Amino acid sequence: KIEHKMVAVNGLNMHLAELGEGPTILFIHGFPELWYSWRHQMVYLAERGYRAVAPDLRGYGDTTGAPLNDPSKFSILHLVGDVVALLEAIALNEEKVFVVAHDLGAYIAWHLCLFRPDKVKALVNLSVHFSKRNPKMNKVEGLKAIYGEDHYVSRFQVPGEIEAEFAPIGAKSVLKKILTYRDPAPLYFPKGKGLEAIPDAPVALSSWLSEEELDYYANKFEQTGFTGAVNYYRALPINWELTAPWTGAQVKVPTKFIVGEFDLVYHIPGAKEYIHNGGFKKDVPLLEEVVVLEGAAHFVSQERPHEISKHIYDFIQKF
C-alpha cells in the first residue's frame, strides 16, 4: 500500500504520497484535487515497475507553510520552484524523471518544462494545453471579457469572497458539484447564489466517484478551506507579468496530451483550433499525437482511470 511522508521543500512542509520502486513518475494534481486523484494511476504504474510520487501542492491538503493571506506566493514561479526543490530532495540520482499532470498541475508542468527541461525525461499533460502568452492581456482579464463577472476565474480573484460563498454550503456539496460537473460551459458563481448556476448531470454519469472517495476530499477541504487552492487563480495576473521572458519560447520535452471531449477547458474559444490545427505543435515541437477521450469530462484521471493509466504506460515505455 501507499506510503506518506513529509518532506521539507522550498520552505514548505510538503506532504508526499509514494508507491512502488523503479524509475520515478512525478504526478501533479489540479484544482480542486489532491495527491488522492492519482490513486488509480499510482497503483497501476507501481505494479508495472515504476515509482509513483504524488505530492499535495502548496496550499492543498497536508502540505503546509504557505501564507494564505498572500496570493503572490502562489505565482507560477513559486510553484515550479517547489517542484524543483522536491525533485532535488526525492529524485536525487535520476538526471531526469517522468511527469504526469492535470489541470493547474498541467499549467505548472508546462512551465517546469520551459524553465528546466534538463529535469524532465517525458511529459503527459491532461486537460490544459500549452497556452501562448497573450501580449495584449492576461487570462483573468481575457476570460472576464468573454464570460463576465460571474465566471469562476473572476469570482475567485478577491480574497474571502468565494470562501464566504462556500462557507454556508460546506466542502462536501461544493466538491460534489464540481467533481460531478460535465457541461463544456465554464462554471459560474454569481454573488449570493451559491451553486445554483451549475447544471447537474444524470446521476449515472458520475458513478466513477464513490461516496467514500468524495468523503476523502470533503474531509481535507473541510480542514484546510479553499484559500490555498483558489490562490493559484489569484496569482494569474502576476503570472502574466512574470512569464514575459518566455514569449516565443518553446517546450523542448517529448509530450503527450490527453483531454476529455466535454472538458470545459477544451471548449475555451480557439482551444480546438490551436490544439488540432498546428499552433500546439509549433509551441511544443516534440508533441506526440493528441488524444481526445470520447464521452469524458474534465476529471479524466478519475473518470477513465484505465484509459488514462494505459496511455501513460504506453508512452513512458518508449523511453
Q: Would you call the peptide bond into 135 cis, given omega within 30 degrees of 0 as the criterion?
A: no
Q: Which of 15, 188, 176 is nearest to 90 (CA)?
A: 15
Give the integer Cα–Cα distance in Å for 306 and 127: 17
Residue at grid coordinates 495576473: 237
Q: Are strands 120-126 and 97-102 parallel, antiparallel or unpaired?
A: parallel
Q: How many CB atoms are located within 10 Å of the residue 291 CB?
A: 16
HSE of 63, CA atoms in CB hemisphere, 13 A: 29
Which residues are registered as beta bridge partners of 97?
Answer: 120
CB 112 within 8 A of CB 124: no
Distance CA 58, CA 34 (A): 11
**Contact at 8 Å (CB) between 36 and 302?**
no
Beta strand pairing status for 24-28 and 97-102? parallel
For residue 90, give the amino acid letter.
I
How determined?
A: X-ray
Contact 259, 292 (CB under 8 A): yes
Helices 227-234 and 211-224, axial angle in degrees (round to 10): 80
Question: Helix (H, G, I), strand (E, B), or coil: what is residue 42?
Answer: helix
Declared resolution, Å? 3.0
Q: In the chain, what is the straight-line distance between the N-terminal and C-terminal CA atoms, in Å?
A: 27
287 Cβ contact list (under 8 Å, min separation 6): 255, 256, 257, 280, 281
The catalytic site residues sit at: 103, 233, 298
| 76, three cell numbers | 507560477
Q: Assign domain 1-319 to a CATH class.
A: alpha beta
Parallel, antiparallel, or unpaired for β 120-126 and 255-260?
Answer: parallel
Is there a contact between 23 and 50 (Cβ–Cβ < 8 Å)?
yes
DSSP H stretches of helix in the chain: 39-46, 76-90, 104-115, 139-147, 152-155, 161-166, 171-179, 211-224, 227-234, 236-242, 271-276, 279-283, 300-303, 305-316
